[PDB]
Structures are given as structure tokens and as C-alpha cells.
From a paper:
Our data show that this locus orchestrates the degradation of 1,6-β-glucan, and this enables B. thetaiotaomicron to utilize this fungal polysaccharide.
The β-sandwich domain contains seven antiparallel β-strands in one sheet, with two contributed by the N-terminal region of the enzyme. Inspection of this region of the enzyme reveals a deep U-shaped cleft that houses the catalytic residues. The active site cleft of BT3312 adopts a different topology to the substrate-binding regions of other GH-A endo-acting enzymes, which typically display linear or curved clefts that are open at both ends. Interestingly, NMR analysis of Candida glabrata 1,6-β-glucan revealed a hooked, U-shaped conformation, which is complementary to the topology of the substrate-binding region of BT3312 (see below).
Numbering used by the authors: 36 to 62, 65 to 495
The structure:
Amino acid sequence: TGDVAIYTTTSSLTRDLTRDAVNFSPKLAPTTITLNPAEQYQTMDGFGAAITGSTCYNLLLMKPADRHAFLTETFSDKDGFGFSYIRISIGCSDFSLSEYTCCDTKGIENFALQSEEKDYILPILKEILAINPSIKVIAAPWTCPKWMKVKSLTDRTPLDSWTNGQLNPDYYQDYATYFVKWIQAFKAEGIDIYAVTPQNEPLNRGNSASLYMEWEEQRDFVKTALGPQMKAAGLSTKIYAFDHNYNYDNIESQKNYPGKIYEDAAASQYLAGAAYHNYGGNREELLNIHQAYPEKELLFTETSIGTWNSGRDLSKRLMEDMEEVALGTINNWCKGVIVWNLMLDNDRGPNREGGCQTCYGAVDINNSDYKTIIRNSHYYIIAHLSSVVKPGAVRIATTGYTDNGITCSAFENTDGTYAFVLINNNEKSKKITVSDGQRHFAYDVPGKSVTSYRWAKS
């Protein structure tokens, strides 16, 4: 205990979200980072991970108390790290236990939540809500029902495929109804959907489930059906555009995907902003979009670790992920950060043919005991945000000490606490002083570390 609460993680695991504390120093010093609460940037919604079918199946195979302890650690603000934003699929994802939608039988009248929601998703989200009742939930479809597809806008004949195709414009109003019924069926279970996107990775035709949707199609779906139908149903649910990569998969016509939709006033009126993933391109794109459309929101919604980037090796992952995913997106105006599967087993699953089969969880659980859990970089990068940066916090400017290896972000929470998150990507420890303009503290910041700080303003 003391004036300043600290969480520390080192890439060597000499520290592992280890708790510490210091008190304010009275009365002048070198290597000082100063918070300027007067210069305010975006307001923060939250941070967390995806609650997929696989994640739920793995949680549900644990002993109840063990499951509840893990969810508490993860999601409780007062007794854990306070993960504050989750992402789920509308119908299946590539980490569902099958390919399905909530209207597989032709006709929108047939709409219903399926066994995956009833048996896996809903019971897990209810336990999460019991722990953290204000958690934000964003959702997206991986595919529309198969009968709503055509092969292409050129060839408007049915495509009976979980992957590829485009949305038949004749079904835009019925697909919008699908979203409304889905949001409403979740609300009847006690779950508020905070936001949606129209389609996960709309420029991807592969995966185990997908639907190709160019910006012109998403513009039209939103302005003519999804926007108006959600508003008429009285939904506060926000809509984010895009939900794909920074480089737009190098498809010339689709560059500035969300910006092109914003320039249609009728579509733009329904759009909070844009969601991004980081599987291609450069995060500078976030600053480019923010500068072009500064009244539109940015959200970071998906990234992965796996066999392609030594995802289990924290000595290779922690620094880079905290830089690029966590503080790199937030310092480029993202209002939250959400990684992919919260939990997969040590066999990278369960998973789907055509989907990712080389992915690791934010944590991995051992499928011999459903007890032993190892945290991977994603769990740390999120917990380092969510433990100290609470919903409604405002990101604020910092000035003073920097060098190569030092990255930081500072915030002011609505409760009158400041929060500071600091990467020291240098082999050596650094005695850093942190000042809020009125009081200051100092701390021996370990090498190759992430440290998170929280303290009361005077």
C-alpha cells in the first residue's frame, strides 16, 4: 500500500503483474515525465479480449470455482485486472464449435439464438456480468445466413457457402432485421450490446466463415437498412465501420474504406467510427484517419499471437505487443483495445477447418487438467491497461524524459485518479520521476518491463 499503486511485468517473468507501491516525494529531479491534464485527447471505453465459443468451452470444462477465480482475476475491477470490453460473434466465428448463423433456415421469421449461444456464450457472459456488470460488448458477424448471399454483385445467383460471396442487396432490410432481433434477444438475456460492426474482416473471402463486403456495399447496407432499423427499434448500440486491416489488404478501390463511407452524409450519420485489426499495414493509418475525420471514433478490435510469431515466448512478445497493440493504438487515438480469444487450450483449440489453427490464447489452459493456465503477452498488455485505465478515462499529454525504448500513455479517470502506463524497452533499470503538475513520485523501473501506475489527484 501507499499513495501510488503499481503493477509490473518483465519480459523475463521476474515480475508477473506483480503489485507494488510508492508514496509521493516531497519537493526537483532529473528523468521526469510530466502529465498535462489540460491537454486532453480521446475518452477511453475499455480493453479486453474475445469470448468465443472455444474460450467458453474451455472455461466450462474447468471446475466451477477455478473458472470463477479466473474470471474474477480477469474481469473484476476491485478484485482483479478489470478487463472492460469484450468482443463476440453474431452467429459463428472461426472459434465457434460449428459453422452456423441465427437464421440458417430461409426466411427472417425463423430467427433464433442457437445452441452455441444458449449453452456456451450466454452462461459465460452472465458470469462475467455478475463480476463486472458495466462491461462493454462489441459484436460482429463472420457471415450472413447462406441464403442471403450471391456469388458476386456481377452474378446475382445464390451461393450456398459459409465463406465468400457478397450480401444480396434484396436482403439488406432482412439482414438489418437479423441484427435487431439478435441485439434484442441478447437484451432479453440481460446483456447490453454496446456496439456492432457490419461484418468481421469484410475484405477477407477465406476463413471458416466470411462474407466479402466492399465499402460501397457497407455504405448502402448501413444507410438504407442497418442504421435506420436500429434507430427505429430504439437501440443505443453504436455502429463501427470496416473491422479490418490498416492497409485495406492492398486493394486499391478499398483504400480509405471507412473514410469513403464517412463522406456519404446519409451513411455517416449512423457511424460512430471505424474498427481496425493489425494483421497488415502500419498503425500510422490510425493517425491518418483520425486527422481526416476527427469527430469519428477509432477502436482497436482484433489481433492474434500464434506459431508465426513465437506467441508463447514472452521475451519476444511482451515489449513489441505492448508497443504496437496497446500503447501504439491508444497513442494513435483508439478508444479501446481488444485482442482475440481470451483462452484456448494447449492444442490451440478448439478450432475450425479453414480457420486459424496456429493461434494461441491470451491465456492457454492445459487440456489434461483444465486447471493450469499460462498467461501470454496479450493477457499482460490488456491487464496493464485495464487495471489502471477505467472506462470514461481521458488520455492526456505528457512531456519531458524520453529516449529510445521509452513509450508511455497517461490518463485521468472520472473518479479523480491519474493513470500512467510505461514501457521500458531497455535492458537497464531507470529511476523515473512522474509528476502530475502538483505532486510527484519516483520509481526504479525495471528493464524490459511494463509498469502501470494509479494515484489520486490532490
